[PDB]
Paper text:
The crystal structure of [name] from [name] strain CCS1, a member of the Pfam PF07336 family classified as a domain of unknown function ([name]), was solved to a resolution of 1.45 Å by multiple-wavelength anomalous dispersion (MAD). This protein is the first structural representative of the [name] Pfam family. Structural analysis revealed a two-domain organization, with the N-terminal domain consisting of a new fold that we call the [name] (for Alpha-Beta-hairpin-Alpha TandEm) domain and the C-terminal domain forming a treble-clef zinc finger that we have termed the CGNR zinc-finger domain after a characteristic sequence motif that is conserved in this family. Jan_2411 forms a dimer, with both monomers implicated in the formation of a putative DNA binding site, and analysis of its genomic context suggests a role for the [name]-domain family in stress-induced transcriptional regulation.
The final model included one protomer (residues 1–184), three acetate molecules, two glycerol molecules, one zinc ion, one nickel ion, two sodium ions and 240 water molecules in the asymmetric unit. Arg185, Ala186 and Thr187 at the C-terminus and Gly0 remaining after the cleavage of the expression/purification tag at the N-terminus were disordered and not modeled. The first domain (residues 1–142) can be visualized as two subdomains (H2–H4, β1–β2 and H5–H7, β3–β4) that share similar topology and secondary-structure elements, namely a helix–β-­hairpin–helix motif (H2-β1-β2-H3 in the first subdomain; H6-β3-β4-H7 in the second subdomain), with an additional helix (H4 from the first subdomain and H5 from the second subdomain) linking the two motifs. The helices of the first subdomain (H2 and H3) are stacked per­pendicular to helices H5 and H7 which, together with H6, form a helical bundle capped on one end by the 310-helix H8 and on the other by helix H4. The second domain (residues 143–187; H8, β5–β6, H9) forms a treble-clef zinc finger. A high degree of conservation is observed for a number of positively charged residues (Arg143, Arg161, Arg165, Lys177, Arg182 and Arg184), suggesting that this region could present a nucleic acid binding site. Furthermore, residues 146 (a hydrophobic residue) and 167 (an aromatic residue) are highly conserved and could intercalate between the DNA bases. Analysis of the crystallographic packing of [name] using the PISA server and analytical size-exclusion chromatography in combination with static light scattering indicate that a dimer is the likely quaternary form. However, given the prediction that the C-terminal domain binds DNA, then the N-­terminal domain may allow the protein to act as a signal-dependent transcriptional regulator with the [name] domain conferring sensitivity to some as yet undefined ligand.
Residue numbers in the entry:
A (entry chain A), B (entry chain A): 1 to 184
Write the structure that this text describes.
Amino acid sequence: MNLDSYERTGLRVSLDLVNIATPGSRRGTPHTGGCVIEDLHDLLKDDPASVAQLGDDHVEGFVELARLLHTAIDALSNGQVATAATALNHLLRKHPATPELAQDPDGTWRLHHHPLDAELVPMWTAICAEGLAREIGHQNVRRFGICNAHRCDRVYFDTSRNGTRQYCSLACQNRVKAAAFRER
Amino acid sequence: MNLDSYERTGLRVSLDLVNIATPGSRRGTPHTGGCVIEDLHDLLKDDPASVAQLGDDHVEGFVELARLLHTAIDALSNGQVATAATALNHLLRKHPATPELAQDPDGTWRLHHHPLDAELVPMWTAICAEGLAREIGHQNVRRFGICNAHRCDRVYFDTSRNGTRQYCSLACQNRVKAAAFRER
Ligand code: NA
Ligand code: NA
Ligand code: NA
Ligand code: NA
Ligand code: NI
Ligand code: NI
Ligand SMILES: [Zn+2]
Ligand SMILES: [Zn+2]
């Protein structure tokens, strides 16, 4: 899997949005969470149309989306697939999730997991929900993890062949490595 | 790609339905097309719920679906992606295409490309349309082909690594091989 591909947009944005907005800890430090519009510009950068339409009114919607996706991802990390499925199914019903083909300005045809007339927060809700749902269908639930590092509860999706990744980031991987000698 | 997998159901059923119902020629012989309910029982065998609900009233709907999918697949084989996209988008709008997670009786979670309360022909229309649409999004249009054998216009999706398959079936591959010496 290429987590940066168009095809994994919903998965990638879900992880990134939860990791921005969900309070907890990040890379060894308490993390306040929430977000500001600048976080959304960078979150949604792969879609110039979204970025062109973002306003401060979208922040509350993305914070709420983050809360819902965090609950689902945490459920998946615990094997509580039914809990995640119930929530994702409701999002797919509530928001416009009819797929639609369209051609990017460079000519590339894409399958969008929403109609092009969707509103912005409903659109991203559908995209994110389908992306997580798809990974459940693809039997990848065990690849959703919560960072094993001290004072980090950021989420990750393990893209390794072996499926034994423990840490959310190279940052946490490095922090653990750098503590190994002294903690021996 | 595994064309027999759950994940390629829409693609597989689309090809099979077109090849049953579309008049033309098949494996060297004129092909009348149409279908009967027995064709649908075998077409949809991977879904016991569909098979349990099939009736003769569904035959007309599947013949019409076949006509629409044949037009799309023939368009794809010609690189006429916009023509295919317009038709597939309309099917996805017309029919229930909201995805839904559910657990098979064996416990396996699946992403269905329709709500579980869908009617039978609308359901299969959505499944088939999404399956074809997905392959357009995955940049696989050039893998949709029309058999090169004499008096065969059956369709196929090339699953080979090299993407140079010419014939719809081992049957047509063998018929061509068996004619090579005499036609030399
Ligand atoms: Na919906
Ligand atoms: Na941790
Ligand atoms: Na629809
Ligand atoms: Na032919
Ligand atoms: Ni999109
Ligand atoms: Ni289904
Ligand atoms: Zn971490
Ligand atoms: Zn053939």
